[PDB]
């Protein structure tokens, strides 16, 4: 019941969290976090 995609429109490092989450918002998603690796933009929703 958790399902995690990265920004589509994301391939750069996530300086904060505001721009992911901007991302995940228009893409239908819960709410998006910053990875500590390439630091791409995770968005997580309800599934």
Known sequence: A????EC???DSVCIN???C???CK???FSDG???KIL???LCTKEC
């Open 17 to 19: 969290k505001k721009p």
């Open 33 to 35: 976090h910053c990875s």
């Open 21 to 23: 989450v901007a991302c």
């Open 8 to 10: 589509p429109t994301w």
């Open 2 to 5: 958790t399902c995690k995609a």
């Open 39 to 41: 630091r791409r933009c």
């Open 26 to 28: 228009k893409a239908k």
